[PDB]
Design a protein around this ligand. Structure first.
Ligand SMILES: CCCCCN(C)CCC(O)(P(=O)(O)O)P(=O)(O)O
Ligand SMILES: [Mg+2]
Ligand SMILES: [Mg+2]
Ligand SMILES: [Mg+2]
Length: 508
């Protein structure tokens, strides 16, 4: 990554009329007659190509009327149709019971019938649908285990390279857990080779992708300029994480109309990865204690006591925090500086508890560690910032409620932390080793336990999305998509993902 070259991008196309024509056509298709299984497959194709943000209402209405049609003959007895309907309806907020899978099980033992290994597409759809489940839905747990076992069994026996690629991709990460934009870039190429491929939808996908990528490149140019202006790229003992943070933010939100929010999120992310290193890599406890005190008091009057290599990240945090709070004051009429200050103070207190534990040789339980680490991962900061920047009529009360980390937000933060600990030269007190110290458990027993925690908290997020809350569409999607971006990173192979998504356009 030549940041010299990324300041280039965004400085330097009219396909927008054809884009609007293709959008009207795809929209008519979504409203079109569409025998119901074909309509489901089309809606799911539109989603996988990253186009749901264009056709929100049409997709919702189409799925709502599919749910309310008078007859079930078109999907019952059909595993692919049953699973796809389950998943899409339950993604749309329309509950479907797990009972619909019982007719594919041996009615005595509850096991899915081994003969289903003859239906690869149905197995894939059952697999994908299983990750829409909640706690206590045992049929969906069984569906996950069975489908994964069978798919890995037959992956070597599949001779269609396209379907082998799809099966391998699903085994890497289920669709429910995948970052939308990167998955869209992958599935454009995949969809171009599918059986019932619709060329109108494919062309619109490619064109819309290039346009959104143009917005992204302008954003990257501005952010690289700012980041060089901070001088933080030239820190020897701190990660140069501007482009990594922007990739995180793309996973969190990719819509062009949210661009400015992205930039701020990106900024915060960068600073997070810098300050963490200040706390994890190169910093005296006296230096970090002073860092934390200054941040808690929001008072930079004694900042010159710090060496300039620490003084620059601290003051960049300070000034960017004030800038974002003032953006809130100006554009939303609400001074957000106290809340950016609060979230940074809380995150530095979490960093401080972690560093103090290390120096003390403390070995916390997994629960204690996680209580601190859902904050130290930084996503309370990022999510409260996104809420500040996007909520209608911001108030002290709304901000206090979101910053209290209710179950929905707290589950997303926990997931980000434990996913990063599964993906992880620093502080070796992470999730796995905390559990090992707790229970004396094995390396791999602890790892599988943490993976089970991943599944459990995803179940809780799924059930949260069905339950009333004072949160609305954009923040909802933010909360899910930070977990998806975490899955994206801690599965450089991430570098070439950035090249394919943010740098190179799609040839048309
Ligand atoms: C974009 C904001 C999240 C990016 C990841 N941050 C660096 C978190 C820091 C960590 O996760 P990292 O593993 O050091 O990257 P930590 O485990 O030290 O808390
Ligand atoms: Mg770290
Ligand atoms: Mg750390
Ligand atoms: Mg770490």
């Amino acid at each position: 990554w030549d940041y010299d070259f990324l300041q280039s991008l965004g400085r330097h196309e009219e396909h927008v009329g054809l884009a609007e024509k293709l959008k009207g056509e795809v929209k008519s298709l979504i409203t079109g007659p569409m025998e119901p299984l074909a309509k489901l497959e089309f809606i799911d194709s539109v989603r996988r190509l990253g186009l749901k943000y264009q056709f929100e209402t049409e997709m919702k209405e189409a799925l709502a009327n599919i749910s309310k049609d008078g007859y079930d003959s078109w999907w019952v007895d059909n595993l692919r149709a049953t699973a796809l309907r389950f998943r899409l309806l339950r993604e749309n907020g329309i509950f479907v019971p797990q009972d619909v899978f019982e007719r594919f099980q041996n009615k005595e033992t509850g096991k899915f019938k081994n003969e289903l290994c003859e239906d690869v597409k149905g197995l894939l759809n059952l697999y994908e649908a299983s990750f829409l489940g909640w706690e206590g839905e045992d049929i969906l747990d069984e569906a996950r285990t069975f489908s994964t076992a069978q798919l890995k069994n037959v992956e070597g026996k599949i001779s269609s390279p396209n379907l082998a690629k799809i099966v391998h991709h699903a085994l890497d990460l289920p669709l429910h857990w995948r970052a939308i934009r990167y998955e869209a870039r992958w599935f454009i190429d995949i969809y171009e080779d599918e059986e019932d491929m619709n060329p109108t939808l494919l062309k619109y996908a490619k064109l819309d992708f290039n346009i959104v990528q143009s917005f992204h490149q302008a954003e990257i140019g501005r952010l690289a300029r700012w980041w060089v202006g901070t001088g933080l790229d030239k820190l020897p003992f701190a990660r140069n994480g501007l482009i990594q943070s922007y990739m995180y933010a793309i996973g969190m939100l990719f819509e062009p109309h949210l661009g400015e929010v992205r930039e701020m999120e990106a900024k915060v992310g960068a600073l997070i990865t810098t300050i963490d290193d200040v706390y994890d890599v190169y910093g005296t406890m006296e230096e970090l204690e002073l860092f934390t005190d200054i941040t808690e008091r929001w008072d930079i009057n004694r900042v010159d006591q710090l060496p300039r290599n620490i003084r620059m990240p601290l003051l960049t945090m300070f000034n960017t925090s004030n800038d974002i709070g003032y953006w809130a004051l100006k554009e939303r009429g609400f001074n957000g500086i106290p809340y950016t200050a609060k979230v940074w103070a809380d995150q530095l207190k979490s960093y401080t508890k972690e560093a103090k534990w290390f120096h003390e040789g403390h070995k916390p339980t997994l629960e204690e560690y996680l209580e601190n680490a859902l904050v130290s991962i930084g996503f309370p900061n990022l999510l409260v910032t996104s809420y500040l920047l996007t909520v209608d009529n911001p108030t002290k009360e709304k901000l206090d409620y979101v910053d209290s980390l209710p179950l929905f937000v707290r589950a997303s933060c926990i997931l980000c932390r434990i996913i990063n600990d599964l993906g992880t030269r620093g502080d070796n007190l992470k999730s796995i080793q905390c559990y090992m110290n707790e229970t004396g458990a094995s390396q791999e027993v602890a790892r599988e336990h943490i993976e089970g925690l991943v599944r459990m908290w995803w179940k809780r997020l799924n059930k949260c999305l069905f339950e009333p809350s004072p949160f609305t569409e954009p923040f909802l999607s933010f909360t899910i998509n930070v977990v998806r971006g975490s899955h994206f990173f801690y599965q450089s192979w991430t570098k070439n993902q950035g090249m394919s998504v943010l740098i190179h356009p799609i040839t048309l």
